[PDB]
Design a protein around this motif. Structure first.
Motif, PDB file in Angstrom:
ATOM      1  N   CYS C   1     -23.291  -5.043  14.425  1.00  0.00           N
ATOM      2  CA  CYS C   1     -22.340  -5.558  13.472  1.00  0.00           C
ATOM      3  C   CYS C   1     -23.126  -6.814  12.800  1.00  0.00           C
ATOM      4  N   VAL C   2     -22.589  -7.276  11.597  1.00  0.00           N
ATOM      5  CA  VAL C   2     -23.337  -8.226  11.022  1.00  0.00           C
ATOM      6  C   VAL C   2     -22.069  -9.064  10.384  1.00  0.00           C
ATOM      7  N   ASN C   3     -22.659 -10.421   9.959  1.00  0.00           N
ATOM      8  CA  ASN C   3     -21.555 -11.458   9.490  1.00  0.00           C
ATOM      9  C   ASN C   3     -22.026 -11.684   7.919  1.00  0.00           C
ATOM     10  N   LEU C   4     -21.158 -11.459   7.131  1.00  0.00           N
ATOM     11  CA  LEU C   4     -21.122 -11.912   5.674  1.00  0.00           C
ATOM     12  C   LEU C   4     -20.181 -12.975   5.157  1.00  0.00           C
ATOM     13  N   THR C   5     -20.678 -13.804   4.358  1.00  0.00           N
ATOM     14  CA  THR C   5     -19.937 -14.843   3.489  1.00  0.00           C
ATOM     15  C   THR C   5     -19.870 -14.416   1.935  1.00  0.00           C
ATOM     16  N   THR C   6     -19.314 -13.227   1.705  1.00  0.00           N
ATOM     17  CA  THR C   6     -19.256 -12.727   0.230  1.00  0.00           C
ATOM     18  C   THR C   6     -17.754 -12.523   0.050  1.00  0.00           C
ATOM     19  N   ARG C   7     -16.767 -12.829   1.001  1.00  0.00           N
ATOM     20  CA  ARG C   7     -15.373 -12.530   0.665  1.00  0.00           C
ATOM     21  C   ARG C   7     -14.788 -13.290  -0.387  1.00  0.00           C
ATOM     22  N   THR C   8     -13.758 -12.781  -1.037  1.00  0.00           N
ATOM     23  CA  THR C   8     -13.211 -13.475  -2.045  1.00  0.00           C
ATOM     24  C   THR C   8     -11.791 -13.833  -1.822  1.00  0.00           C
ATOM     25  N   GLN C   9     -11.199 -14.932  -1.726  1.00  0.00           N
ATOM     26  CA  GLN C   9      -9.927 -15.225  -1.048  1.00  0.00           C
ATOM     27  C   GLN C   9      -8.749 -14.811  -2.455  1.00  0.00           C
ATOM     28  N   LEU C  10      -7.995 -13.771  -1.786  1.00  0.00           N
ATOM     29  CA  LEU C  10      -7.115 -13.322  -2.852  1.00  0.00           C
ATOM     30  C   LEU C  10      -5.730 -12.859  -2.022  1.00  0.00           C
ATOM     31  N   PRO C  11      -4.455 -13.453  -2.310  1.00  0.00           N
ATOM     32  CA  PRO C  11      -3.433 -13.039  -1.664  1.00  0.00           C
ATOM     33  C   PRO C  11      -2.932 -11.531  -1.828  1.00  0.00           C
ATOM     34  N   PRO C  12      -2.545 -10.896  -0.904  1.00  0.00           N
ATOM     35  CA  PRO C  12      -2.205  -9.637  -1.101  1.00  0.00           C
ATOM     36  C   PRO C  12      -0.852  -9.431  -2.103  1.00  0.00           C
ATOM     37  N   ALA C  13      -0.716  -8.199  -2.794  1.00  0.00           N
ATOM     38  CA  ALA C  13       0.217  -8.332  -3.723  1.00  0.00           C
ATOM     39  C   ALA C  13       1.633  -8.243  -2.901  1.00  0.00           C
ATOM     40  N   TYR C  14       2.896  -8.347  -3.730  1.00  0.00           N
ATOM     41  CA  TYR C  14       4.232  -8.433  -3.040  1.00  0.00           C
ATOM     42  C   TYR C  14       4.653  -7.445  -4.089  1.00  0.00           C
ATOM     43  N   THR C  15       5.466  -6.427  -3.408  1.00  0.00           N
ATOM     44  CA  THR C  15       6.249  -5.395  -4.438  1.00  0.00           C
ATOM     45  C   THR C  15       7.578  -5.099  -3.398  1.00  0.00           C
ATOM     46  N   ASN C  16       8.479  -4.370  -4.184  1.00  0.00           N
ATOM     47  CA  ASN C  16       9.920  -3.946  -3.500  1.00  0.00           C
ATOM     48  C   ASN C  16      10.065  -2.611  -3.169  1.00  0.00           C
ATOM     49  N   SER C  17      10.825  -2.429  -2.513  1.00  0.00           N
ATOM     50  CA  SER C  17      11.197  -1.025  -1.608  1.00  0.00           C
ATOM     51  C   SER C  17      12.795  -0.841  -1.987  1.00  0.00           C
ATOM     52  N   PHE C  18      13.078   0.299  -2.588  1.00  0.00           N
ATOM     53  CA  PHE C  18      14.446   0.531  -3.172  1.00  0.00           C
ATOM     54  C   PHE C  18      15.290   1.360  -1.863  1.00  0.00           C
ATOM     55  N   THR C  19      15.068   2.269  -1.504  1.00  0.00           N
ATOM     56  CA  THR C  19      15.785   3.204  -0.778  1.00  0.00           C
ATOM     57  C   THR C  19      14.700   4.069   0.221  1.00  0.00           C
ATOM     58  N   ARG C  20      13.754   3.440   0.910  1.00  0.00           N
ATOM     59  CA  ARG C  20      12.804   4.064   1.637  1.00  0.00           C
ATOM     60  C   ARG C  20      13.033   3.329   3.191  1.00  0.00           C
ATOM     61  N   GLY C  21      12.655   4.420   4.079  1.00  0.00           N
ATOM     62  CA  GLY C  21      12.685   3.971   5.486  1.00  0.00           C
ATOM     63  C   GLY C  21      14.166   4.245   6.271  1.00  0.00           C
ATOM     64  N   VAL C  22      14.322   5.409   5.985  1.00  0.00           N
ATOM     65  CA  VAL C  22      15.465   6.141   6.396  1.00  0.00           C
ATOM     66  C   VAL C  22      15.294   7.340   7.361  1.00  0.00           C
ATOM     67  N   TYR C  23      15.450   7.276   8.635  1.00  0.00           N
ATOM     68  CA  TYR C  23      14.879   8.350   9.555  1.00  0.00           C
ATOM     69  C   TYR C  23      16.197   8.731  10.624  1.00  0.00           C
ATOM     70  N   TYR C  24      15.957   9.822  11.115  1.00  0.00           N
ATOM     71  CA  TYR C  24      17.002  10.401  12.088  1.00  0.00           C
ATOM     72  C   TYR C  24      17.041   9.472  13.316  1.00  0.00           C
ATOM     73  N   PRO C  25      18.153   8.966  13.323  1.00  0.00           N
ATOM     74  CA  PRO C  25      18.098   8.062  14.687  1.00  0.00           C
ATOM     75  C   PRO C  25      18.765   8.724  16.030  1.00  0.00           C
ATOM     76  N   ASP C  26      19.230  10.034  16.057  1.00  0.00           N
ATOM     77  CA  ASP C  26      19.685  10.795  17.309  1.00  0.00           C
ATOM     78  C   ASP C  26      18.944  12.319  17.105  1.00  0.00           C
ATOM     79  N   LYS C  27      19.150  12.905  18.233  1.00  0.00           N
ATOM     80  CA  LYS C  27      18.524  13.860  18.484  1.00  0.00           C
ATOM     81  C   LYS C  27      19.773  15.209  18.415  1.00  0.00           C
ATOM     82  N   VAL C  28      20.788  14.873  17.610  1.00  0.00           N
ATOM     83  CA  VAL C  28      22.088  15.794  17.591  1.00  0.00           C
ATOM     84  C   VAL C  28      22.441  16.225  16.185  1.00  0.00           C
ATOM     85  N   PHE C  29      22.853  17.500  16.101  1.00  0.00           N
ATOM     86  CA  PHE C  29      22.861  18.201  14.744  1.00  0.00           C
ATOM     87  C   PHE C  29      24.178  17.703  14.361  1.00  0.00           C
ATOM     88  N   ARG C  30      24.288  17.469  13.095  1.00  0.00           N
ATOM     89  CA  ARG C  30      25.661  17.244  12.280  1.00  0.00           C
ATOM     90  C   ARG C  30      25.466  17.854  10.993  1.00  0.00           C
TER      91      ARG C  30
END
Lengths: 28, 333, 234, 48, 48
Positions: C1-30
């Motif tokens: 491994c090597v050490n470098l000092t060429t990184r540029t400081q920049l905050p990560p972007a911020y975006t929005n999520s509308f209707t994502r992240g829905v998963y089946y919470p139980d193992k039962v059929f309905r």
């Protein structure tokens, strides 16, 4: 009659689920 | 006298609590269809899983470092957990310690340690004290068993044993099923103890120093706690029940992997997908099941039932009756 | 491994999520039922952190408060695996997931990495320098502008590590996509931080651009609709 | 509909179904749970 | 007035006030006392 037909049309799996619990509906 | 099961008129009399029946229509009872056979379906696992070395072990761990072992995918037998010692304590919460040979569990947890003699009562739901809040804490919705037995002849020694330790001083009470192995010094005073002994600087461990000479209520005891989780899952572990061939299109009583019922089993058309085991309905009751030896889905439907009414004139006139079956097409009585 | 000092400081972007992240919470059929659940979900219309990787190197260390929703928009499979742990050294257990050429390997034990771990067409696999005895190992079938959208949900509760996954062919888009459960693991570790893994190959040369989004889960109550089949449609 | 939906209540018992209660506890102890369930269901039907 | 006054009856428990019940004795019997109070208060509401 015409008006009676219109009135009859105006007013209108769950039944099986209810029946399997012991609740029934009797006819007039 | 009147026999309440000879003919419909007698049943009507028995329901009305009278020897004379007047003209009218009376609702007597309901008719059902009784089962004929009986089937039991359990997984085909036949191997055993470690119970000998959990109890027949050389050295158990201290209280603050209690030993935990996970048991899964085996066939559990509890008959061997009878002749541990001439006398021992065996208390089960949530189950009775005689019926756990025909129950199917998801995962079994075994926690083993050694406790002072008179503290055995402290391994229980919702009890406070010295070890129940600083060494080992149990939840209030526990479902499992606790076994304790004498260990004087094996653990206590004349020369002196100091390998067993507990904890006396701690900030806050432990979360259930949480362990601590920290040795950082106590800080009762306002000044740092700089990692040295002194006033208000106490080492938070203590010793037992068991000798064969103390009284009957002070010798070490060996304690093992079994924790279950009775929920919906592939049912990895459960005991010795013989299976039987399944029948279809006939009202029978069934025991699917621990779920008992009566009804008719039919081939299913539901669109199950790999991780789905069973199904429910509008009223939150089981409707479909998966056989744990063929990976096929079956539908459960209770066998035929209905209501019966009796139409008769007065008993003064005649003893003839007519029978009305409600809501059934009597080509399929 | 090597050490470098060429990184540029920049905050990560911020975006929005509308209707994502829905998963089946139980193992039962309905089927064709409205149901109510109370569990750790992703709040609707919530801000999430967006990192873009093409040069520029962005593999920070992020917390593991309660759960992680990890989304990746990508082409040509640059994002490879995941590292989970508490201190990221040989003093505590660490969980490691790597996608092989035609397999996936999961293992939990001690390891050793550099200050900026990375992965070096694959011929050399050198991410960790040392590995002591490991408790749990697992090998399975591979999990598989921008043309691939991969959604994953990582949870750790009740002494079990749960991985839910979903894949889709197509600044996140609209729509609804339920996530089917993929793996359960009986690990039982502390887990506090994690860090992603991308693949780089030396090579005029064109580097595939990738983006990935991180969001955090909170306890919430949801009302889910099951259609005629066992599909969550809203 | 609400009379049907009342059947999933526990009323302080260990489960909302009877067969598992009868298949997990000895006769001396299952009586309290059975009594709780029976009393709750009777009250619901009477209110209806 | 009667609905308000119904709040100060034991229904067969140690005391009407529930924090004293929680502090004095262990959860195993505190659950029974709490269940008694809940059932009594629900019955009073139904009658009202």
């Amino acid at each position: 009659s015409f008006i009676e037909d219109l009135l009859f049309n105006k007013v209108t799996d769950l039944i099986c689920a209810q029946k399997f619990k012991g609740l029934t509906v009797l006819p007039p | 006298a009147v026999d309440c099961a000879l003919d419909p008129l007698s049943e009507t009399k028995c329901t009305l609590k009278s020897f004379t029946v007047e003209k009218g229509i009376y609702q007597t009872s309901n008719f059902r269809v009784q089962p004929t056979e009986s089937i039991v379906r359990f997984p085909n696992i036949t191997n055993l899983c470690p119970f000998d070395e959990v109890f027949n072990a050389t050295r158990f761990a201290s209280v603050y470092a209690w030993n935990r072992k996970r048991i899964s995918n085996c066939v559990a037998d509890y008959s061997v957990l009878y002749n541990l010692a001439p006398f021992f304590t065996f208390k089960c919460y949530g189950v009775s310690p005689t019926k756990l040979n025909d129950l199917c569990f998801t995962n079994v947890y075994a926690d083993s340690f050694v406790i002072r003699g008179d503290e055995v009562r402290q391994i229980a739901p919702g009890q406070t004290g010295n070890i129940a809040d600083y060494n080992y804490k149990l939840p209030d919705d526990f479902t499992g068993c606790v076994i304790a037995w004498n260990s004087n002849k094996l653990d206590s020694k004349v020369s002196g044993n100091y390998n067993y330790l507990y904890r006396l001083f701690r900030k806050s009470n432990l979360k259930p099923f949480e362990r601590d192995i920290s040795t950082e010094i106590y800080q009762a005073g306002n000044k740092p103890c700089n990692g040295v002994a002194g006033f208000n600087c106490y080492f938070p461990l203590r010793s037992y120093s068991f000798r064969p000479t103390y009284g009957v209520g002070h010798q070490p005891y060996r304690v093992v706690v079994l924790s279950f989780e009775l929920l919906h899952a592939p049912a990895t572990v459960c005991g010795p029940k013989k299976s039987t061939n399944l029948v279809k299109n006939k009202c029978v009583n069934f025991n699917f992997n621990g779920l008992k019922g009566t009804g008719v089993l039919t081939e299913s058309n539901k669109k199950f997908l790999p991780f789905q085991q069973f199904g429910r309905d509008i009223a939150d009751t089981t409707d479909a099941v998966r056989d744990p030896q063929t990976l096929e889905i079956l539908d459960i439907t209770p066998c035929s039932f209905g209501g019966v009414s009796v139409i008769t004139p007065g008993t003064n006139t005649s003893n003839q009756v007519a029978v009305l079956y409600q809501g059934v097409n009597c080509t399929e009585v | 491994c090597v050490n470098l000092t060429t990184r540029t400081q920049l905050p990560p972007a911020y975006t929005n999520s509308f209707t994502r992240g829905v998963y089946y919470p139980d193992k039962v059929f309905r089927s064709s039922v409205l149901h109510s659940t109370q569990d750790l979900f992703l709040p609707f219309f919530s801000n999430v952190t967006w990192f873009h990787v093409i040069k520029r190197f962005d593999n920070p260390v992020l917390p593991f408060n309660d759960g992680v929703y990890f989304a990746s928009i990508e082409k040509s499979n640059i994002i490879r695996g995941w590292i989970f742990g508490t201190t990221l050294d040989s003093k505590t257990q660490s969980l490691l997931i790597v996608n092989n050429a035609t397999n996936v390997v999961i293992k939990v034990c001690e390891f050793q990495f550099c200050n900026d771990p990375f992965l070096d067409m694959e011929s050399e696999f050198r991410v960790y320098s040392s590995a002591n005895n490991c408790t749990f190992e697992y090998v399975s079938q591979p999990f598989l502008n921008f043309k691939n959208l991969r959604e994953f949900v990582f949870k750790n509760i009740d002494g079990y590590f749960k991985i839910y996954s979903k894949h889709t062919p197509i600044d996140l888009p609209q729509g609804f996509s339920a996530l089917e459960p993929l793996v359960d693991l009986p690990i039982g570790i502390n887990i506090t931080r994690f860090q992603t893994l991308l693949a780089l190959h030396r090579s005029g040369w064109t580097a595939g651009a990738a983006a990935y989004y991180v969001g955090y889960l909170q306890p919430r109550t949801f009302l889910l609709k099951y259609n005629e089949n066992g599909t969550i449609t809203d | 509909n609400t009379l049907v939906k009342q059947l999933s209540s526990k009323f302080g018992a260990i489960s909302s179904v009877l067969n598992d209660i009868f298949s997990r506890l000895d006769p001396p102890e299952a009586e309290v749970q059975i009594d709780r369930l029976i009393t709750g269901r009777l009250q619901s039907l009477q209110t209806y």
